[PDB]
Structure formats: structure tokens, C-alpha cells
Amino acid sequence: DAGSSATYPMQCSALRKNGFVVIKSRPCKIVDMSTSKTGKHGHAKVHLVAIDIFTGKKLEDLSPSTHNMEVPVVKRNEYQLLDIDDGFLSLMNMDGDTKDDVKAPEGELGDSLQTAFDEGKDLMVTIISAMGEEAAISFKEAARTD
């Protein structure tokens, strides 16, 4: 069919390391990039080596330098954890409500997170936003006073 948001449109020559890019319909952080000539004049090919912002599973891409590759937005949001339980996450917010969604332990991060939590401490957990589907990444600590 068709949707739906994000992304942007950006020319393949533009982006650089640490930037974000949708490759094979998957959002990735740019890890390495190059520019070969093959051509002829006046030409170059951008070779983007990029890790997906979720699983990791390294992705590559070879496009004309001129070519426009789709770039995703990334919201990094540091919401406070509340309860697990379960099932799942949960968090709370700044603010707010919320969520009901999110599930990632992962982990490593899983383990950590639960072991946590179960000890004590109220935790700060950032979540990353890929077009629609999301997930946690950082697990932290508050600095409470008033």
C-alpha cells in the first residue's frame, strides 16, 4: 500500500558517520562511509556501512553519490521506569501517563534492568523511535533533591 511517516529524503552524498539512514527499509546509524569513482565523469558512488539502530545487524549500501537515500528521524526520550511487570515496561513519564507499550529488557540490558529494580532504585530509561516501532536503550539513575 502506502503511508505513513517519517522520513526524509536526503541526497546520498550528504550524510556522514553517526548520521541516520533507512537501508532496505530499516533505520540505521552510519558507521562508515566512502566515495569510489566508478563513473565516468563526473561521478562517485557513496558506500555507506551502517548499523541498524535496533538489532545492530550491520547494513551496507552502494548508491550513486547524487542518489537520494531516505533518512529517518530519531527521537531520544528519557522516560522514568515504573514497574516491569511482566509485561511491560511500563514506563512512567515526565509529565505523563504512559507507556503501555515497550518491552525491551533485551539484554544484558534485560538483566541489568531487572536486577535493577528488584533491588530498589527508581530508574531512567531512554527509548528510541524508528518511524513507528520503538524500544529502550539506556538505563540510568535520578538525581533527586526537590
Curated annotation (Swiss-Prot):
Transmembrane segments: none
Effect in UniProt of substituting residue 82 to F: Lethal. Reduced binding to the ribosome
Induction (record text): Expressed in aerobic conditions.
Keywords assigned by UniProt, alphabetized: Acetylation, Cytoplasm, Elongation factor, Hypusine, Isopeptide bond, Phosphoprotein, Protein biosynthesis, RNA-binding, Ubl conjugation
A biological-process GO annotation: translational frameshifting
Locations listed in the record: Cytoplasm
Subunit structure: Homodimer. Binds to 80S ribosomes. Actively translating ribosomes show mutually exclusive binding of eIF5a (HYP2 or ANB1) and EFT1/eEF2. Interacts with DYS1 and LIA1.
Note: There are two genes for eIF-5A in yeast.
Protein name according to UniProt: Eukaryotic translation initiation factor 5A-1
Organism, scientific name: Saccharomyces cerevisiae (strain ATCC 204508 / S288c)
Source species taxonomy: Eukaryota, Fungi, Dikarya, Ascomycota, Saccharomycotina
Gene name, Swiss-Prot/TrEMBL: HYP2
